């Protein structure tokens, strides 16, 4: 026996985010990290390091879009919820949209490796990411104009 089960989002209490993908939220009223799922940040630092491309553009939205959304929603995928390190695993939802999916069609990320089972936003992030590399946008705007053969 083995077709479809049933899942289900809970509401939480967004802490505060020290990266564009480590986020720390409140779950069930408790301190907990959280690293977007199939996400992945291209390495930032602190803006005062002379930087002017992504620096404060990525973690900026991140704990920005977090901060403002009023209704911070999460959604655990079915494979492990938690990794080694206690991190969450999992899909956040700013004002009802896959914040994740907003950082990867915004050319501020990179879909992380995939491992089974969790699949399930994969095909999903598939297509924000081409589109992002066909648009140039922040990570793919260095790509330049190469085309023609």
Do not use: C
């Not at 907003?102 to 490796?113: I, M, N, S």
């Amino acid at each position: 026996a083995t077709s479809t089960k049933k899942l289900h989002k809970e509401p939480a209490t967004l802490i505060k985010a020290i990266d564009g993908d480590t986020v720390k939220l409140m779950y069930k009223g408790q301190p907990m990290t959280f690293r977007l799922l199939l996400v992945d940040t291209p390495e930032t630092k602190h803006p005062k390091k002379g930087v002017e491309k992504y620096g404060p553009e990525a973690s900026a939205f991140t704990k920005k879009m977090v901060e403002n959304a009023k209704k911070i929603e999460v959604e655990f995928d079915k494979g492990q919820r938690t990794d080694k390190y206690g991190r969450g695993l999992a899909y956040i939802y700013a004002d009802g949209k896959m914040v994740n999916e907003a950082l990867v069609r915004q050319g501020l990320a990179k879909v992380a490796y995939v491992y089974k089972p969790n699949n399930t936003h994969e095909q999903l992030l598939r297509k924000s990411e081409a589109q992002a590399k066909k648009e140039k946008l922040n990570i793919w705007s260095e790509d330049n104009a190469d085309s023609g053969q």
